[PDB]
Each structure stands twice: as structure tokens, then as C-alpha cells.
């Protein structure tokens, strides 16, 4: 292909990329329908799996739950490309694929993401109408059934953190949650990619309580942050959302930990505020390369726990 991973792509190009990458790597990748957005845009994930007789555990990664965070879908595509281009020759990727399958959701909030290209670059929420169309959008990362709407979320539909009309009320959330719920016993690690702030966040947002395996989570997280910084010197902070970012509820990260997935992280990618959400394309390649180091460090650690 002549598909550049060093620029931002509108949704139509991502639909075509998923279809092309799936056929070119058909021996190890399949594309699966999860559901449709409010506006009937299809939501897919890519499953990377090297066929074998071993039972597989699952790594889940999703990007673009928040529409304006363009660096996150860029990284999901970078991740996929790196795995696929190196899954035969690279001993470390070949290792991971002997026992893990990767499920990657490149853009979850497709309606909002299209909206940021067509109309409003700083849109965050979905595009579902509320109050007879007088307001639009649910914050999909406040819509999961994890202490739903208890703190750090609004019941006001005009607010950027609107939690929705009820837990798992939006079609995007339903599609993710029902699927994840059906695989939960096999999912070892849940990664949700966001921007910006250069943080690696553990549960929880809705309490300052820590999960039962919090020491293990921040050891893995800090080693990943160290591996990331080694690349270009980018500084990341590791800790629970409530401690180092702000309180929230209904996040997919907390919901995943609550249903028993042992490693659940939110990554907040570049930068620290100079450009914010509108990260220049000149920073896509270095952001993705350093983030790749972090993610493979996590996957190495998760893997070493079992094989």
C-alpha cells in the first residue's frame, strides 16, 4: 500500500484501510462487526490471531472513544501495522502471538469522529440526540455500567461529560459492552487509548480505593512508562485516575476491571498541553513509536505471568 501512517485519516479512509489490511493479512487477521453507531455507521474490530492449537487469551485495545483525540485512532492503526508487518520475523511478536490474540477497535465513536472532520474539531461526545434534538451527544466514557453517574459525570445533556440517559444507554456502548462481557473470562488486558496528558492510568476514577492487584498494575505501568521515555525522553506519569487526573464514573477502564479483567489501563498520549488535542502530524510517528514501546512492555509483562 501507499497508506501513510504518519498523517491523520478521515473515517472513509479508515474503513478502506480495515478492508485492505484484512485481505492482505488474511491468514492472521479478520474483521468483525460489533454493531452500528446512532447514525448507522458500522463499528468493527480487527482480530489478530496466529492460528494454532493453543487456547488464546485476549488483549483488547480500543481508540477514539472521544472524537477529538485524533492521535488515538492513529496509534491503533500504527499498532496493527507493526504487529502485521513483523508477525513472522520478529521473535517477540511471534512469542506474544503463540498465546495471545489481539482485538483492536480503531475508532469507537465513529459519529463524533466524522463530526470533528466535517464540523467541529473539538467535539468529544457521540452524536445521539437528546431532549427532542435540542442537544447532542453522550460522553461514551461515562456511559459504562461502573458506578454509573456517581461522580465526575453530568446528567445535563448539554455537558461534555453527560453520562447518558442510563447505564449502557448508547448503541456504541452496548456494542462494546455486550461483546466484552461475552469474552471477559479470556481477556487478560484492556487498553483504552486517549489524549492528551502523557499518563498511564489504572483504576479507579470513581473512588480513591485501589484494586486488589494495584501494586502489580503500577509496576507494569511504570516499566512501560520507562520504556516509553527511553525513546525520545517523553515523560509519563503512572497512577490511578482519581489520584493523578480527576474523578470520573462509568469509564470503560473501570468497568473492565470491575468485571474481573486483571489489567485495565487508560493511556493518555501526547502532548502535555502545548497543542492539546490538535497534535501536529509531524508528531504522529514519534508518538506512535514511543507508545509502541510502552504497549509491548505491558504485553511482555502480561505474557510472562502465564507463559
Amino acid at each position: 500500500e501507499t497508506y501513510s501512517y504518519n498523517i491523520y485519516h478521515p473515517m472513509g479512509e479508515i474503513y478502506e484501510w480495515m478492508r485492505e489490511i484484512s485481505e492482505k493479512y488474511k491468514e492472521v487477521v479478520t474483521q468483525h462487526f460489533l454493531g452500528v453507531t446512532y447514525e448507522t455507521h458500522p463499528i468493527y474490530y480487527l482480530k489478530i490471531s496466529q492460528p494454532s492449537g493453543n487456547p488464546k487469551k485476549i488483549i483488547w485495545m480500543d481508540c477514539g472513544i472521544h472524537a477529538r483525540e485524533w492521535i488515538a485512532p492513529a496509534f491503533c492503526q500504527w499498532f496493527v501495522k507493526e504487529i502485521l508487518q513483523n508477525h513472522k520475523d520478529n521473535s517477540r511478536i511471534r512469542k506474544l502471538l503463540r498465546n495471545l490474540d489481539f482485538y483492536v477497535l480503531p475508532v469507537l465513536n465513529i459519529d463524533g469522529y466524522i463530526y470533528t472532520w466535517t464540523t467541529d474539531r473539538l467535539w468529544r461526545k457521540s452524536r445521539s440526540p437528546h431532549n427532542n434534538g435540542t442537544c447532542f451527544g453522550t460522553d461514551l466514557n461515562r456511559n459504562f455500567n461502573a458506578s454509573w453517574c456517581s461522580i465526575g459525570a453530568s446528567r445535563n445533556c448539554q455537558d461534555q461529560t453527560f453520562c447518558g440517559t442510563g447505564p449502557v444507554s448508547e448503541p456504541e456502548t452496548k456494542a462494546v459492552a455486550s461483546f466484552i462481557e461475552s469474552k471477559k473470562d479470556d481477556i487478560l488486558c484492556f487498553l483504552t487509548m486517549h489524549s492528551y496528558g502523557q499518563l498511564i492510568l489504572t483504576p479507579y476514577g470513581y473512588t480513591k480505593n485501589k484494586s486488589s492487584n494495584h501494586p502489580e498494575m503500577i509496576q507494569v505501568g511504570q516499566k512501560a512508562a520507562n520504556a516509553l521515555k527511553a525513546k525520545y525522553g517523553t515523560n509519563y506519569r503512572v497512577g490511578s485516575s482519581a489520584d493523578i487526573l480527576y474523578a470520573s464514573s462509568g469509564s470503560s477502564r473501570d468497568w473492565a476491571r470491575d468485571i474481573g479483567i486483571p489489567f485495565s489501563y487508560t493511556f493518555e498520549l501526547r502532548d502535555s498541553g502545548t497543542y492539546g488535542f490538535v497534535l501536529p502530524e509531524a508528531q504522529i510517528q514519534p508518538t506512535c513509536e514511543e507508545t509502541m514501546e510502552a504497549v509491548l512492555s505491558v504485553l511482555d509483562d502480561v505474557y510472562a505471568k502465564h507463559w
Partner: protein
């Protein structure tokens, strides 16, 4: 339809990424049952900004 006037947000809460930003309630005419559409807009130093990551 009487489109509500733009005004400061009422009890807007924090803007964690830009703590001193200003929240405005902004409505525009729209083709729906009530004739308008509203949202909260955050601005700092003359530019719209995001508050949550």
C-alpha cells in the same frame, strides 16, 4: 420559536485541563420540534478549548 439567549453556564463545574476557562451556554436555531439546539462551550484567551481528556 424562541431560541434561548446565550449566557454564562449555570454551575458549570471545573475545566480540569484549562482551570481558568469560561463556560458559555450557546444555542442556535435548528430544524427540530423546539427550533433550536444548545451546548456548553469553553473558551480561554479567545479560543475554544477542551476540558476533559
Amino acid at each position: 420559536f424562541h431560541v434561548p439567549d446565550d449566557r454564562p453556564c449555570i454551575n458549570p463545574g471545573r475545566c480540569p485541563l484549562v482551570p481558568d476557562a469560561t463556560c458559555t451556554f450557546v444555542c442556535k436555531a435548528a430544524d427540530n420540534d423546539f427550533g433550536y439546539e444548545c451546548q456548553h462551550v469553553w473558551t480561554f484567551e479567545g479560543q475554544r478549548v477542551g476540558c476533559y481528556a
